[PDB]
Design a protein around this ligand. Structure first.
Ligand SMILES: COc1cc(/C=C/C(=O)O)ccc1O
Ligand SMILES: COc1cc(/C=C/C(=O)O)ccc1O
Lengths: 177, 177
């Protein structure tokens, strides 16, 4: 069996791509933006940092961490590797939807309406984060330092907007004329 | 520590909601439609079936399995329970996108174009499954026996369409005028 903390490997190497960071800084990215789409069990971060140092991908000199040439190559190879798209992530709400025959029209309406209100609230939160990012002076483009952050935030916004739209469509079918 | 096979519990109870099924039938739903969004390690199915029988949620009389009144209540309580939306599923491609600063414009174009072609192919596959479902005679509605299947398939189609659209948008930014 392999160590579950290995899931943090490329997240850690990537965070270091632009230059040195303290463990505090790294831990901070996980507590903030990076933890929203690549959650860490915070107990795993320092141990994985140690493993990557010991494997020669990261060095340190507070301790300040940087990529080695080996680390840079390790991150580059992973970025450019093509992998099949993975298996669909288990969405428990969608398993419920699959079994909707076990609910009355009203029960189905209440289940879907609960999910819609929750997803609209999440979308409001993402929209806030997006507006915060976009409050920067430099217009957004491929060359912006913040382009990767823009990519993750716009993906999440589109994702939740699409979930909301789908739920509204189903509610209209549950509430057919 | 709890048993990972417990992830199959409500999938199994739900499959039995409309009446008796053989283990072959249950295994078949997992190999086909249900495995596409709620994947089972096929080694876990029979053991979980046994656990649910022994817990009194399912009975058997080939062995043919049915929900007990307890099982029906167990499925009902889960269906109507409201849970917070869970944490975002780790999408490794999106971690790469977050670190796009480590790629040239051409490298970024090639990465995103690979992902787009793969997602368009998956979408073609979902569209085929959708057309197969919709080849039934009875028009689709809340009251259709197939409404739950429609829900999972349309969700998946919308999901992948939205991913494709997002990728196209990013490719156009990578290829700005
Ligand atoms: C709320 O702020 C953020 C959220 C995300 C991603 C969220 C998700 O994929 O669900 C990414 C960057 C952010 O700054
Ligand atoms: C390809 O056929 C199917 C696919 C799905 C779901 C796929 C997913 O969520 O990725 C559901 C029912 C189907 O019949």
């Amino acid at each position: 069996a392999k160590d579950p903390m290995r899931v943090l490997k490329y997240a850690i190497l990537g965070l270091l791509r632009k230059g040195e960071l303290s463990g505090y800084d790294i831990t901070s990215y996980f507590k903030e933006e990076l933890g929203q789409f690549w959650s860490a069990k915070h107990s795993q971060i320092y141990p994985e940092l140690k493993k990557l140092t010991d494997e020669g991908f990261i060095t340190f000199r507070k301790k300040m961490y940087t990529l080695t040439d080996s680390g840079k190559q390790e991150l580059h190879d992973w970025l450019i590797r093509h992998q099949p798209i993975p298996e669909t992530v288990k969405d428990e709400f969608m398993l419920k939807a699959y079994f909707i025959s076990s609910l009355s029209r009203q029960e189905a309406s209440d289940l879907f309406t609960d999910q819609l209100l929750k997803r609209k609230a999440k979308l409001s939160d993402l929209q806030g984060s997006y507006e915060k990012l976009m409050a920067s002076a430099e217009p957004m483009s491929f060359s912006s330092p913040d382009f990767g952050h823009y990519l993750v935030l716009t993906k999440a916004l589109e994702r939740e907007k699409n979930y909301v739209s789908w739920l509204e469509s189903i509610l209209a079918m549950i509430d057919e004329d």
